[model samples]
Target: RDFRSADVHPADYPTVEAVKFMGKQLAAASGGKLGVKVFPNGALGSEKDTIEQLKIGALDMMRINSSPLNNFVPETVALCLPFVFRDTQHMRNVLDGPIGDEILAAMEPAGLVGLAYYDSGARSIYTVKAPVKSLADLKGLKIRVQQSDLWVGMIQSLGANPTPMPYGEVYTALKTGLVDAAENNWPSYESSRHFEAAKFYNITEHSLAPEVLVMSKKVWDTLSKEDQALVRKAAKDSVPVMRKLWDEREQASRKAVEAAGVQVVTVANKQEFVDAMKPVYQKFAGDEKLSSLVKRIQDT
Candidate 1:
């Protein structure tokens, strides 16, 4: 969903490979009558463009980070909220279990069908020169954030000016002082060399993000029932493989970053960071429709 050389690239994120494998299996399962051609590395465009293309029937499928979908269907943004789950197992339980299915069901009418969820690991902050240990540490700094309401609100709540930018531009943004900080999982911070520009790493583990593997309804509807079933099977079968990849990558990233001489700080009181974003919760709670989504996720 970022750049081709991004840490989230196919070689690093096995979920991409899993999707590729699923597509190939699906084609074979459908007797070669149906096949998917993946456009990796911004070939189709940015995440925003891909989402728009998917909505309008211009693209068949693509795996996207769930952040952008917040504005269109605020309910989906519930998945992007900070510190919602206790751990990865808790996350899996929520998503793979009934609640996850319920959330996926919300995407149907939007002209996209959720096939499966890929792990995005947890998020942390990479700053220009200083470790971001608290809201005060981040004060008045401009940081790169995904183009989403929740991210903007979260950064603002913590007193940083959230600068919305594409993932591809972040390295230069950090280097040229266009942004002072950017948030990502460990692997992304290291691979993208945002570490080169941002020497400090903060393990906020602020949120649990899931990469959405979705297809345009236009493409989905054109397939025969059997072809559809093939895709469903492929996606279902690929979950364990993707999860293992995510776990391995997360560990590898930690070791890689730590060895690179970067100052990596781990916070003990994550709830303090969560509490600082109380206004974010309140923002959604004030809106009945949005609040329902938040309530549903929190209640679960």
Candidate 2:
């Protein structure tokens, strides 16, 4: 029998390939008694919908961003913070390194097992009107965000009118001038062709939130000890495979968009953006448990 895994990207994407690798290795180890079947292109459903499926045991496995996990897992709140990491390397190292174990381990209470941490790169803002040359330029510009209050608050803290929208709606909103801008990782921004609609880009590098391969704890409870061990093995082994392809995808997507005349600019005054997040930090990481977790990531 095969286990069902859901991925938002289509086949041949990094996470899908990694899960395929997981299945290949698992089949070898389990003698085909256990295998994985990935539903790509979000064929299973939207992340929000599938997350509900995970909780109900209707979906076995999923690759998802950390933002949505925040509602269920308090530990996820740490990564949701803007400027949570000093650099991309810090974020990656924390996600996959020893520090990440604590973050991943805390998911069980939420009815999900965080299988592994995958790269999402940094999410920056892209706009249809003008390049955000300064913090003031972002004032009142409606920037689309995932359906998370913290993220909506992040935009609000950044001095913008935050808009809550799903992934499928963003491009149309951008085209219709419904929202001035949207933030995304390069691969998402490029593959969705959001770059084509944008008049300018700002590399806010605001958040380096990682994606995760997670299993439905509801389904996990149905497996035997030996079977449970194999699934974790399958997922962990798949992580390195995902990271390698993610790096390649990240480069290729940026190169693809850059060559397409998508104008890009780096942050000139970094402190200006980071300064706005103090309120965000206070609001989410105010408690001892969360602030210490945030501190651990900072020190990591």
Candidate 3:
């Protein structure tokens, strides 16, 4: 069966570009019989809406960040816990190894088939009013976050009010004073032009929420074994392509936003931000299994 995928990012975004490569590989592997066609820029709908479509088989596939996905697969939220990974390399090591497979495997029960993960870089808070020089500055501020309790709790722990909003609605929210700040990777800040409205870019670098490439299991069950292998191989093959472009785009995004006059500030005491998340960590620590996964990731 012919397959389709959707992403909210622009066509040039690494996640979007990488899936296009996956589509090409699928086409070549199947001689054009079972290739994927992608709908970029939310051509299908918002991520939440598309995820619903995927569950009901109204959509074949979608690339989604792990943030909003916590509502469906709670285990996946462990990866987004504050200060989970040391750096980009540390994060990649976990995601490219067995740990990643275990997390991806958990999604099958949620009616989705996880193909692979792509980089989303580290997420930071950007505000319209002032620079987040310290954790205290965040108090009483309205910060836009993905529609996830995990995210809402994280922002709340930082002394900010978590304003859950659709990704496409953030810029307008910022411009209209609906939200004081929003958090995301550098590329998203630049790509969505959120930097245009929110001028204070803070290097909170809170979490590295990776993107997941998933297929509707309803669609996956209908595929032949050989076709499944072809698609899975193609998905794996697209990883490096996406990673390379991700780094390049991240650098370019930083330069673009800086050139646009967005004042980038690094938190003077990042440890404070980390310390503030202790409650969040405690909240999840209640689950031994999830705590074990967090420990393993931290050890990595």
Tens-place lDDT per residue, model 1, 58-113, is 77777878887777666677788877766788787677766666666677778877
Task: Tell me model 1's lDDT, rounded to 2 decimals.
Answer: 0.75
* Highest lDDT against the true fold, candidate: 3
TM-score of candidate 2 relative to the true fold: 0.96
User: On residues 1-300, what C-alpha lDDT tens digit does candidate 3 reach at each position?
Assistant: 568899998888899899989989889889988777889998899888888998999999999898778888777887888898889999899998888888888888889888999999999999998888999999999999998888899998998899888899999999999999999999999999999999989999999989999999899999889998999999989999999999999999999999999998989899998889878877854487678878888888
Model 1 / residue 11 / CA error / Å: 4.2
Clash statistics: count for each candidate: 0, 0, 0
| lDDT comparison, 1 vs 2, better candidate | 2
Quote each prediction's TM-score. 0.91, 0.96, 0.98
Query: Model 2: how far is 246 from its true place, Å?
Result: 1.3
Candidate 2 has an lDDT of 0.85
Give the winner by TM-score: 2 or 3.
3
* Regions of candidate 2 where Cα sits further than 4 Å from its true position: none
Clashing residue pairs in candidate 1, if any? none
Lowest lDDT block of 10, candidate 3? 281-290
